[PDB]
Design a protein around this ligand. Structure first.
Ligand SMILES: O=C(O)CNC(=O)C(=O)O
Ligand SMILES: [Mg+2]
Ligand code: NI
Ligand SMILES: [Zn+2]
Length: 331
């Protein structure tokens, strides 16, 4: 079995190898990459996402989210308070202000220490989940707005024809902006490109051990667990590496820098934080190997997780027994 310790793998495709996206994903899995839950892909030196970022300040962040924490430094939840709209130029200036800017630090490890010590005492503002793309239309390789759609994958593998669409999302971050522990909708893959700015640190649990994380989360957030049998779908809970290690949960960590892709694999729980002002683009995708994960994915029906239009068909076709209850949660 390849990668039996479930380490995060880093890939350096050549420009030739960068042509066929599906083929390269399957290659990485042949080497055991999926066992980690997360892989890094460094693009060939000849590739670029777009010519310059010199013109992005006019993008609007219609609903910036202030991420307010509750709990203790290593075990907390965050709620999102909606803020007034602002442009990316306005948001960048805010990120760089004395109140929000990255503190002085020695290296990524020192910054990580500072994040886990102090995160809860601040409320950074995240421009998350903005439909759109920063890839040039002329970028033909690994262009996250030109991928094969999940609906087309389901049609090719299973024969069924369904409504729905599959588009990318932009994320504008600042110091301490946080993504809570989660798997993707329907335990899909994700791919994330860091277009510019400061790094993003990731934590990940191997898919084969995801239920260990779920059991810890039920212990650590016991009221949330009674409320919902899949409350990690709410995307609000944080658990630090120190707490994970104290509880014997297998995990790995890695830092993504501008110009790099990360892939999350089906049922790979992940969480992390931004180092400073940055912009990422991400989208969900599927392969043949996903279908069995989609059939088994948990679902929130309590009403909190509320998701896209396109998830309806996935539940309806892959999980017809659950459909009625899950749709009550949506309505
Ligand atoms: O970058 C972020 O805030 C969160 N991204 C992801 O969870 C992802 O790409 O799957
Ligand atoms: Mg602009
Ligand atoms: Ni994700
Ligand atoms: Zn729920």
């Amino acid at each position: 079995a390849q990668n039996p310790n479930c380490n995060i793998m880093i890939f350096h495709p050549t420009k030739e190898e960068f042509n066929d996206f599906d083929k390269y994903i399957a290659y990485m899995e042949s080497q055991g990459a999926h066992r980690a839950g997360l892989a890094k892909i460094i693009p060939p030196k000849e590739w670029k996402a777009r010519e310059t970022y010199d013109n992005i300040s006019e993008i609007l962040i219609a609903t910036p989210l202030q991420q307010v924490a509750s709990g203790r430094a290593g075990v907390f939840t965050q709620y999102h308070k909606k803020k007034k709209a602002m442009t990316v130029g306005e948001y960048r200036h805010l990120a760089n202000s004395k109140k929000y800017q990255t503190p002085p630090h020695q290296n990524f490890e020192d910054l990580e220490r500072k994040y886990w010590k102090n995160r809860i005492y601040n409320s950074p503002i995240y421009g998350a989940d903005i439909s759109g793309s920063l890839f040039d239309e002329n970028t033909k390789q690994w262009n996250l707005g030109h991928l094969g759609t999940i609906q087309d994958l389901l049609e090719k593998e299973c024969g069924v024809v369904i409504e729905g669409v599959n588009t990318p999302y932009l994320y504008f971050g600042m110091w301490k902006t946080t993504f809570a522990w989660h798997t993707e909708d329907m335990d899909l893959y994700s791919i994330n490109y860091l277009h510019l700015g400061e790094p993003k640190t990731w934590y990940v649990v191997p898919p084969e051990h995801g239920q260990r994380l779920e059991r810890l989360a039920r212990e650590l957030f016991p009221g949330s667990s009674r409320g919902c049998g899949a409350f990690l779908r709410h995307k609000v809970a944080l658990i630090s590496p120190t707490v994970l290690k104290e509880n014997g949960i297998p995990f790995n960590r890695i830092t993504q820098e501008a110009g790099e892709f990360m892939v999350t694999f089906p049922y790979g729980y992940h969480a992390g934080f931004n180092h400073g002002f940055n912009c990422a683009e991400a989208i969900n995708f599927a392969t043949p190997r996903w279908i069995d994960y989609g059939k088994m994915a948990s679902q929130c029906s309590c009403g909190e997780a509320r998701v896209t239009f396109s998830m309806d068909a996935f539940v309806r076709i892959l999980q017809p027994e659950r459909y009625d209850l899950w749709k009550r949660g949506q309505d």
